[PDB]
Amino acid sequence: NQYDTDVTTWSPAGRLFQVEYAMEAVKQGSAAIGLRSKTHVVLACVNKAQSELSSHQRKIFKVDDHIGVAIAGLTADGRVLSRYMRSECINYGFTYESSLPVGRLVVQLADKAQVCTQRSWKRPYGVGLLVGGLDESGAHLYYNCPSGNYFEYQAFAIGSRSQAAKTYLERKFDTFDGATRDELIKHALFSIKETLQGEKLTSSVCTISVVGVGEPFQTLDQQMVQDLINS
Amino acid sequence: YPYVTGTSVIGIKYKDGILIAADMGGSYGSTLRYKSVERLKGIGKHSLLGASGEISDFQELLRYLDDLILYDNMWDDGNSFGPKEVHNYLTRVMYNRRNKFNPLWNSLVLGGVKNGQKYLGTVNMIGVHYQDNHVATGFGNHLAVPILRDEWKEDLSFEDGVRLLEKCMRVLLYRDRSAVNKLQIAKITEEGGVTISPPYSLKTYWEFAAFKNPTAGAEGS
């Protein structure tokens, strides 16, 4: 395919095959879940237990007191973007001494991914983010995509075997609107259970994080998550 | 060097809002070249600032703030800069331009009310800044903060606020030699927005017997 091998060449169908492939990178990576309420946004990640010897790597990144991330895809590009968002929020705080809204940070991030998508000699970042934080209008959940498009969701699952999580969230996202923090966490555990092919309910496989209107971003501990699944 | 410079810009946080006053004079050395230079402006929805010092630099700060506020508005995501963020941006720009040894020669008084939290603060030509109930710049920092401190009250009315602020501004007009009798009071409130008083001049008193006759005699004085 002559149009496949470069970012700048539109195919006759109007498709950027390189960006489509960069979006294939995330669909191949480990799964991440995200879901929100009027005030809370829960970011989880079914982080695999591949071997009795290996451990996983940190995927859900804090960015500010009020914004969290959950990368998916090439972990290095995710680390670069998370570093960028962290520095951006810190600059905003330095200048205006206030929290950078999520809705603006996500748009800046999407512009970064796009400007990579446009120039030759570059590549689309190849990592998709679930970003969720705070804003005067409450708490929002966003999905940045390598193509420069971005979206706002009630709940979204990306990465490998997400259809199992999406088909569940489809049948429960409608109650999240006003649901209390713990209801979101329980829903997220159920979602992770669905995508868990082994169907084994253990605290080691999945990580959870929560950020709310008065709850700074924090990652639930192994013992606490184990306690919830025990319920 | 400062070429066309203005003078004091006093500030007084009053009940339900904020008031700022500043004469309409721009002086050139000793001459008053200009007497109708509106030196108070409204910034964004929630703010209001006056400036003293070089008037070219102030007009530039207005361009900076107008771009800032327009870019802020075009988002339409439902959050905007209150007085706090605007004042912090002003402090940052003033300090940064001091670091270049190319200062904005102005002293900024910025205040406003957002979400029921009313803010008032100041910035110097070299980044010195503080937020207070009542602020002033230039001679308003000598001849007006004494009287403001003496008489300011927690729940000052609007009329009491105007009368205090005119007391201060008149005291300046008596003894500044840089001040013109024209002047404006700016009112900012929640859900009313900024409202700038039309220019006017204050009555002044001179008929004291000691003034009419320094010393005292039928011939001398």
Side-chain angles (χ1 to χ4, degrees):
Chain A
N1 192 32
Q2 286 190 314
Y3 321 95
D4 177 299
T5 189
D6 203 318
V7 58
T8 60
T9 60
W10 289 88
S11 48
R15 289 165 62 185
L16 288 63
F17 271 101
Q18 279 288 291
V19 187
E20 302 196 350
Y21 297 160
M23 294 183 286
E24 278 295 319
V26 65
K27 293 175 213 171
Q28 301 272 49
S30 178
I33 308 294
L35 61 83
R36 75 183 277 275
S37 66
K38 295 288 98 172
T39 51
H40 283 278
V41 188
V42 171
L43 299 174
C45 164
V46 61
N47 189 359
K48 297 184 179 183
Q50 301 90 341
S51 65
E52 289 65 26
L53 312 171
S54 175
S55 189
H56 56 66
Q57 66 284 24
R58 176 168 171 78
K59 286 184 174 89
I60 286 171
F61 298 80
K62 184 175 175 182
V63 168
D64 199 2
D65 271 10
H66 75 295
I67 319 178
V69 172
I71 62 170
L74 299 192
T75 308
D77 297 87
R79 211 182 298 120
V80 167
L81 288 181
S82 179
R83 190 193 309 145
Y84 163 66
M85 293 182 286
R86 287 153 160 189
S87 71
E88 182 65 26
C89 292
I90 292 158
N91 289 346
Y92 190 98
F94 181 97
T95 308
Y96 307 108
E97 294 188 38
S98 82
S99 294
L100 169 69
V102 180
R104 305 189 177 188
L105 178 61
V106 162
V107 168
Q108 292 173 17
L109 183 63
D111 288 346
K112 287 277 283 190
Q114 189 281 341
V115 297
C116 281
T117 291
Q118 186 148 35
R119 277 136 200 70
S120 194
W121 81 90
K122 291 200 77 94
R123 61 164 176 75
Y125 267 108
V127 71
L129 283 72
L130 293 180
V131 189
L134 301 181
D135 179 8
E136 283 197 45
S137 298
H140 308 311
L141 172 73
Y142 288 99
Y143 163 50
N144 283 86
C145 84
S147 59
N149 288 275
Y150 81 90
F151 308 94
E152 191 179 320
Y153 278 87
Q154 281 281 27
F156 203 51
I158 65 171
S160 184
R161 214 183 306 91
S162 294
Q163 295 298 121
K166 281 199 306 188
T167 50
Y168 167 90
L169 294 168
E170 291 277 333
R171 292 183 291 113
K172 300 291 203 180
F173 85 94
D174 46 356
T175 70
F176 300 176
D177 210 44
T180 190
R181 161 172 171 152
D182 308 306
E183 286 174 33
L184 273 45
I185 288 165
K186 293 179 179 179
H187 276 294
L189 277 297
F190 268 54
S191 309
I192 294 279
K193 191 200 308 179
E194 286 279 13
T195 186
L196 275 164
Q197 55 178 0
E199 202 160 33
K200 60 183 181 286
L201 288 162
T202 185
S203 52
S204 188
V205 292
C206 73
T207 176
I208 299 184
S209 177
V210 180
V211 65
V213 294
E215 281 64 26
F217 182 86
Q218 64 189 359
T219 63
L220 312 190
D221 59 87
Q222 181 179 358
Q223 183 66 41
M224 187 66 204
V225 63
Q226 189 57 65
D227 287 352
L228 282 71
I229 296 89
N230 298 356
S231 303
Chain B
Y1 194 75
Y3 290 112
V4 185
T5 318
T7 189
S8 167
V9 182
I10 343 179
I12 315 180
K13 188 191 283 180
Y14 86 104
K15 193 171 60 174
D16 65 70
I18 287 170
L19 286 153
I20 292 154
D23 73 354
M24 284 174 99
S27 57
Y28 184 100
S30 76
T31 315
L32 305 171
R33 284 186 65 95
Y34 310 98
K35 286 188 172 181
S36 173
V37 57
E38 287 89 27
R39 187 176 65 246
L40 300 175
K41 297 291 168 85
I43 297 89
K45 288 168 281 187
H46 312 282
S47 302
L48 165 71
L49 74 88
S52 74
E54 179 63 8
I55 300 295
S56 60
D57 298 339
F58 167 47
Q59 294 178 342
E60 187 67 3
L61 272 156
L62 287 171
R63 318 176 94 80
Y64 290 165
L65 293 159
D66 183 40
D67 283 348
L68 178 75
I69 294 302
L70 173 61
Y71 279 150
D72 179 45
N73 271 280
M74 293 183 286
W75 281 92
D76 202 33
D77 58 344
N79 50 16
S80 175
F81 302 168
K84 182 176 173 65
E85 288 97 324
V86 179
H87 176 253
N88 290 120
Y89 174 85
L90 283 175
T91 57
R92 292 278 71 74
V93 59
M94 302 283 287
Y95 181 64
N96 296 353
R97 286 203 60 168
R98 167 266 193 172
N99 292 339
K100 301 201 293 180
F101 304 112
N102 189 256
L104 291 165
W105 190 262
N106 290 119
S107 301
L108 276 293
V109 167
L110 188 143
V113 54
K114 189 178 173 201
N115 297 344
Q117 288 266 324
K118 52 189 77 82
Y119 181 111
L120 181 68
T122 294
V123 184
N124 201 359
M125 70 160 295
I126 55 177
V128 168
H129 58 288
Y130 56 91
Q131 63 84 30
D132 199 339
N133 290 318
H134 49 268
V135 302
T137 76
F139 265 67
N141 208 1
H142 299 100
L143 292 162
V145 294
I147 190 167
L148 285 165
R149 288 172 177 151
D150 193 349
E151 315 205 5
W152 189 81
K153 299 195 292 182
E154 175 70 21
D155 63 358
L156 212 60
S157 191
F158 167 60
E159 297 88 354
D160 302 315
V162 162
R163 284 193 260 105
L164 175 59
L165 183 62
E166 288 183 330
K167 214 178 299 191
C168 299
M169 186 64 72
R170 193 184 275 125
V171 172
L172 286 156
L173 174 57
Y174 276 116
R175 311 197 92 96
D176 196 3
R177 69 177 291 276
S178 185
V180 309
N181 215 329
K182 300 186 55 152
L183 61 83
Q184 290 181 291
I185 314 296
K187 165 175 73 178
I188 170 165
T189 61
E190 191 70 80
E191 66 73 27
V194 183
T195 296
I196 308 186
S197 68
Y200 65 96
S201 288
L202 292 171
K203 276 180 176 180
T204 311
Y205 189 83
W206 306 86
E207 296 91 306
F208 281 122
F211 291 178
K212 290 180 178 177
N213 276 30
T215 80
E219 255 65 35
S221 294

PDB file of all heavy atoms in Angstrom, chain A residues 103 184 199:
ATOM      1  N   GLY A 103     -10.745  20.691  31.011  1.00  0.00           N
ATOM      2  CA  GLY A 103     -11.184  20.874  29.644  1.00  0.00           C
ATOM      3  C   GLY A 103     -10.172  21.604  28.795  1.00  0.00           C
ATOM      4  O   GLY A 103     -10.148  21.438  27.576  1.00  0.00           O
ATOM      5  N   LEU A 184     -19.357   4.277  42.161  1.00  0.00           N
ATOM      6  CA  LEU A 184     -18.457   4.275  41.014  1.00  0.00           C
ATOM      7  C   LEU A 184     -17.349   3.255  41.194  1.00  0.00           C
ATOM      8  O   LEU A 184     -17.009   2.533  40.254  1.00  0.00           O
ATOM      9  CB  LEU A 184     -17.870   5.662  40.807  1.00  0.00           C
ATOM     10  CG  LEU A 184     -18.713   6.586  39.942  1.00  0.00           C
ATOM     11  CD1 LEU A 184     -20.160   6.524  40.336  1.00  0.00           C
ATOM     12  CD2 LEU A 184     -18.191   7.991  40.090  1.00  0.00           C
ATOM     13  N   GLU A 199     -11.153 -14.045  35.102  1.00  0.00           N
ATOM     14  CA  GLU A 199     -12.305 -13.881  35.978  1.00  0.00           C
ATOM     15  C   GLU A 199     -11.904 -14.031  37.440  1.00  0.00           C
ATOM     16  O   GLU A 199     -12.765 -14.189  38.311  1.00  0.00           O
ATOM     17  CB  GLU A 199     -13.396 -14.889  35.615  1.00  0.00           C
ATOM     18  CG  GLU A 199     -14.783 -14.481  36.074  1.00  0.00           C
ATOM     19  CD  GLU A 199     -15.880 -15.201  35.321  1.00  0.00           C
ATOM     20  OE1 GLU A 199     -15.671 -16.370  34.939  1.00  0.00           O
ATOM     21  OE2 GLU A 199     -16.952 -14.598  35.110  1.00  0.00           O
TER      22      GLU A 199
END
